Symmetry: D2
Subunit: 160 residues, 4 copies
């Protein structure tokens, strides 16, 4: 289904994401210039995340404008981050004034696409099905996307 | 392309909608119960609109929960509404949680679908291409959809 | 729902086309040059047809390479054709080597698209829902499309 | 892009399949009962294949109605096959009358779907991009699909 995902909020999916589910995060704007306001955290960070019932972040997708990179990671509920997996940020967005981040579920990894082009395969690290998604940003910053995202959960059979 | 359309706002399209353009208004909420607060207007009205460069509402689609109806109309810039064309509200959205209103452009009419099922063909009345879309509601009411809609502009296939 | 439609054959739809049904005839080839041989009819004609249960051709879409024009019409079963509605052929095909003719059903008219671009609205003339489709050509000619077409029936909500 | 693929033929793709290319083989018929005639091979085998420029079968997808299984493998041109990877046949088809086998390319593997539901991930074994596809059957048998398939080559951005 479709979900409205407001910046700084978590939305519950209607049901756990089934095998091979696809999640599309849609923004209507793209601003790759770093947030004019860095704020108290010292890290320009806007992220989307796939969460399980327990609250673990199965997949964290962070955009780092000041670091020229995407940061992928998994974060167990109430625990610290795992090791980061990073790819350069430049050359990913651009072709769409309305950028999208799509994740395709696979048995042991997530296929991550930017504007429907695959940029990374992230090996799963934590157990459980995705049941929630979030869109967060470090205190006092402005995101690279619209402050509201359209999130669509779909299956291959839905687009065929 | 994709647009975020907030309640009581107008969004400009990236370009004028071309012939046979398709505009999909997506909500992640459905609440067919009339707005608990009716407000000063006395009319429970939440609507989406297609507007030309000149500010004319080419097509107005109103949801009237208190009247069991959809109201379609066109409103010239700074003038009054045209005659209203209505159809029942019941049996359209049903209870699907993410309702959508899709408008498919034709040369002389708009095909209107609720949840991708065609409900009405509205004969065009005003000239000009759709260049902006809006989402409005009468003072003091709560809408039957989410307060933010995802609006997608597309053309059949690729 | 997908169907194989060979040249000079008719194929039953799995069920009649429902309101607002979309039928897409897909070819893997395009050749707008007239058929090398004209044959005995003297009319270079290849066509696809939407037919009801009683055999009536609800909508006939003919491609006339030598006449520079599509021909639209309806033919009751066992009777002669009605008045033809023509549009030029030039300017339709084709942004692609695998052309398609898509028909979108509407209560009173069909919307005809070439390569998903609308080229004409044809007012319905005969009663009944489309339950079969055909792909036909005049004796001794070769078509502008592949000798086999993929026909897909879909609805806006599939999409 | 669309292509007509006849049984016992090989069709060239428009260009080598790019990363994440999706290939959909569509049939307008489904018949899982074993081929009435088995033939001299003694193996009821109908298959589709993805082939590179050198003629190597990058991926072989075989339906074995008398063995209750799909057989996946890669076969270098003019060389014997490698080890087979199999999954049961039962429970994959049956939901629709027009079955399809989709292959979604990944860097080191092919994601295989039956009726758009993923059934297997086959690790790539041979080098080179897919440039041809084929549809074959053992001598004297009839296939579980129509004798002509619609083959669509697309990329996620196309849907
Ligand atoms: C102290 C130590 O052992 N080493 C320091 C590193 O931990 C530190 O790396 C940065 O750490 C922060 C906090 O973990 C990272 O930011 C977090 O990233 C995760 C996803 O990986 C995300 O969920 C959090 O939202 C985000 N935090 C905030 C507040 O934005 C950050 O990416 C790391 N940066 C790196 C590794 O380049 C570095 C800081 O440069 O210092 C070490 O001394
Ligand atoms: C002069 C006279 O006696 N006529 C009365 C009608 O005017 C009245 O119609 C109602 O008028 C209002 C105001 O136009 C309509 O509401 C508006 O609807 C348009 C779309 O058509 C929309 O753009 C506006 O947002 C909306 N305005 C508000 C404030 O919500 C309303 O739908 C009409 N209702 C009808 C026709 O039933 C009718 C009864 O209402 O009585 C006549 O006697
Ligand atoms: C009254 C009279 O006899 N006048 C002649 C016209 O009938 C004739 O028109 C042409 O008629 C032929 C045959 O009907 C048309 O081709 C047919 O087109 C229909 C669809 O409209 C198609 O289903 C048939 O397959 C097809 N027949 C064949 C054999 O291909 C043709 O389009 C008409 N051409 C016109 C009207 O320009 C004209 C033709 O010059 O001659 C009159 O004498
Ligand atoms: C040690 C030894 O001799 N091994 C024998 C195995 O080779 C044999 O396996 C069967 O082999 C046949 C022929 O190779 C297999 O069919 C082939 O399958 C490939 C794809 O894997 C396909 O491309 C070929 O078209 C196809 N050949 C024909 C003619 O259809 C078949 O799947 C194998 N069946 C098995 C292994 O279950 C087994 C068979 O019992 O015997 C060994 O002794």
């Amino acid at each position: 289904m479709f979900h409205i995902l407001r910046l700084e909020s978590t939305v519950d999916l209607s049901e756990p994401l089934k095998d091979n589910g696809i999640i599309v995060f849609q923004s209507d704007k793209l601003d790759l210039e770093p947030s004019p306001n860095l704020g108290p955290t010292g890290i320009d960070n806007t992220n989307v995340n796939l969460i399980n019932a327990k609250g673990d972040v199965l997949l964290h997708i962070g955009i780092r404008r000041r670091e020229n990179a995407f940061v992928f990671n998994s974060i167990p509920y109430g625990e610290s981050r795992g090791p980061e997996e990073r790819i350069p940020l430049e050359g990913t967005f651009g072709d769409r004034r309305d950028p999208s981040i799509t994740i395709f579920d696979h048995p042991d990894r997530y296929q991550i696409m930017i504007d429907y082009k695959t940029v990374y395969y992230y090996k799963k690290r934590l157990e459980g099905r995705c049941e929630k998604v979030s869109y967060k940003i470090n205190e006092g910053q402005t995101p690279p996307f619209s402050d509201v995202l359209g999130v669509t959960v779909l299956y291959f059979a839905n687009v065929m």
